[PDB]
Design an enzyme around this catalytic site. Structure first.
Site, PDB file in Angstrom:
ATOM      1  N   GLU A  35      32.062  43.663  55.564  1.00 40.57           N
ATOM      2  CA  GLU A  35      33.466  43.927  55.297  1.00 40.57           C
ATOM      3  C   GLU A  35      34.005  43.008  54.210  1.00 40.57           C
ATOM      4  O   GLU A  35      34.768  43.443  53.337  1.00 40.57           O
ATOM      5  CB  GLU A  35      34.282  43.743  56.571  1.00 40.57           C
ATOM      6  CG  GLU A  35      34.057  44.801  57.622  1.00 40.57           C
ATOM      7  CD  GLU A  35      34.690  46.145  57.266  1.00 40.57           C
ATOM      8  OE1 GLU A  35      35.445  46.285  56.274  1.00 40.57           O
ATOM      9  OE2 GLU A  35      34.390  47.099  57.984  1.00 40.57           O
ATOM     10  N   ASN A  46      43.819  50.615  50.137  1.00 37.82           N
ATOM     11  CA  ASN A  46      43.381  51.924  50.601  1.00 37.82           C
ATOM     12  C   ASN A  46      44.153  53.011  49.879  1.00 37.82           C
ATOM     13  O   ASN A  46      45.226  52.774  49.323  1.00 37.82           O
ATOM     14  CB  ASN A  46      43.597  52.075  52.108  1.00 37.82           C
ATOM     15  CG  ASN A  46      42.847  51.041  52.896  1.00 37.82           C
ATOM     16  OD1 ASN A  46      41.687  50.770  52.623  1.00 37.82           O
ATOM     17  ND2 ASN A  46      43.512  50.432  53.859  1.00 37.82           N
ATOM     18  N   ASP A  48      45.954  55.393  50.947  1.00 33.82           N
ATOM     19  CA  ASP A  48      47.276  55.722  51.473  1.00 33.82           C
ATOM     20  C   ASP A  48      48.306  54.633  51.208  1.00 33.82           C
ATOM     21  O   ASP A  48      49.439  54.737  51.704  1.00 33.82           O
ATOM     22  CB  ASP A  48      47.191  55.998  52.975  1.00 33.82           C
ATOM     23  CG  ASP A  48      46.758  54.796  53.765  1.00 33.82           C
ATOM     24  OD1 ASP A  48      46.588  53.705  53.195  1.00 33.82           O
ATOM     25  OD2 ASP A  48      46.593  54.941  54.982  1.00 33.82           O
ATOM     26  N   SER A  50      48.016  51.418  52.134  1.00 34.54           N
ATOM     27  CA  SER A  50      47.832  50.280  53.006  1.00 34.54           C
ATOM     28  C   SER A  50      46.790  49.353  52.400  1.00 34.54           C
ATOM     29  O   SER A  50      46.115  49.694  51.426  1.00 34.54           O
ATOM     30  CB  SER A  50      47.399  50.737  54.396  1.00 34.54           C
ATOM     31  OG  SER A  50      46.165  51.443  54.339  1.00 34.54           O
ATOM     32  N   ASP A  52      43.753  46.150  53.376  1.00 31.64           N
ATOM     33  CA  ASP A  52      42.880  45.504  54.352  1.00 31.64           C
ATOM     34  C   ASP A  52      42.745  44.027  54.010  1.00 31.64           C
ATOM     35  O   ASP A  52      42.516  43.673  52.849  1.00 31.64           O
ATOM     36  CB  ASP A  52      41.472  46.098  54.345  1.00 31.64           C
ATOM     37  CG  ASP A  52      41.409  47.531  54.801  1.00 31.64           C
ATOM     38  OD1 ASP A  52      42.288  48.067  55.477  1.00 31.64           O
ATOM     39  OD2 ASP A  52      40.387  48.147  54.520  1.00 31.64           O
ATOM     40  N   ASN A  59      43.670  46.267  58.789  1.00 34.18           N
ATOM     41  CA  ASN A  59      44.489  47.207  58.021  1.00 34.18           C
ATOM     42  C   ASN A  59      45.983  47.079  58.324  1.00 34.18           C
ATOM     43  O   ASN A  59      46.405  47.126  59.484  1.00 34.18           O
ATOM     44  CB  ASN A  59      44.011  48.624  58.347  1.00 34.18           C
ATOM     45  CG  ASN A  59      44.458  49.651  57.366  1.00 34.18           C
ATOM     46  OD1 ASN A  59      45.428  49.477  56.665  1.00 34.18           O
ATOM     47  ND2 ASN A  59      43.744  50.770  57.335  1.00 34.18           N
ATOM     48  N   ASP A 101      41.014  48.798  71.975  1.00 31.61           N
ATOM     49  CA  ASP A 101      41.944  49.922  71.945  1.00 31.61           C
ATOM     50  C   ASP A 101      41.292  51.273  72.245  1.00 31.61           C
ATOM     51  O   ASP A 101      41.955  52.309  72.101  1.00 31.61           O
ATOM     52  CB  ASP A 101      42.678  49.953  70.596  1.00 31.61           C
ATOM     53  CG  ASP A 101      41.871  50.572  69.484  1.00 31.61           C
ATOM     54  OD1 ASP A 101      40.710  50.953  69.716  1.00 31.61           O
ATOM     55  OD2 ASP A 101      42.424  50.664  68.352  1.00 31.61           O
TER      56      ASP A 101
END
Ligand SMILES: [Cl-]
Ligand SMILES: [Cl-]
Ligand SMILES: [Cl-]
Ligand SMILES: [Cl-]
Ligand SMILES: [Cl-]
Ligand code: NA
Length: 129
Positions: A35, A46, A48, A50, A52, A59, A101
Site C-alpha cells: 500500500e 482516487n 472520486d 477522495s 488515501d 480512505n 466492519d
C-alpha cells in the site's frame, strides 16, 4: 518515516495487530509494503476525489476528515493528516475499526491482490519479535 520491515512488524505487534480479528502479523506487514512501501507520508488521490493516507492508505471517503471530500464520512473521528505521523498509533487504531466492519482485510485492495493466499509469514521471517 520509512519503516524497515522488522521495525514495522515490532511496532504493529506492540499495538495489538498480531492475530487481530484472526489476521496474523505477516498479513499487516504485507499490506503496508504494497500500500505504501512502508512510508508513513504516502498519499494517493482516487478517481472520486477522495484521498488515501499513510502506511495503510486509509480512505477519506469513509474514515477520516481532510476537508476536501464532500459528502464523505469520518468514521475514525480523526483528521486524515494524523495518519501521516511517524507514530503509527492513529493508523493502527483506525485500521482496527476497518477490519472489524464485516469485510476483513479485503478492504485493502493491495492485500487482496498481493497478499491474500500467499505465504505471508515470510514478511516477519528473521525479525526479533
Ligand atoms: Cl521490504
Ligand atoms: Cl504471519
Ligand atoms: Cl470533507
Ligand atoms: Cl508508536
Ligand atoms: Cl475475516
Ligand atoms: Na471524510
Amino acid at each position: 518515516k520509512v519503516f524497515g520491515r522488522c521495525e514495522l512488524a515490532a511496532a504493529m505487534k506492540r499495538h495489538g495487530l498480531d492475530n487481530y480479528r484472526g489476521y496474523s502479523l505477516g498479513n499487516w506487514v504485507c499490506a503496508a509494503k504494497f500500500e505504501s512501501n512502508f512510508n508513513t507520508q504516502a498519499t494517493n488521490r482516487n478517481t472520486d476525489g477522495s484521498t488515501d493516507y499513510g502506511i495503510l492508505q486509509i480512505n477519506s471517503r469513509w474514515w477520516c476528515n481532510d476537508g476536501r471530500t464532500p459528502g464523505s464520512r469520518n468514521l475514525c473521528n480523526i483528521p486524515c493528516s494524523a495518519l501521516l505521523s511517524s507514530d503509527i498509533t492513529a493508523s493502527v487504531n483506525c485500521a482496527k475499526k476497518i477490519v472489524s466492519d464485516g469485510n476483513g482485510m479485503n478492504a485493502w485492495v493491495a492485500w487482496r491482490n498481493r497478499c491474500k493466499g500467499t505465504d505471508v509469514q515470510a514478511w516477519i521471517r528473521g525479525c526479533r519479535l
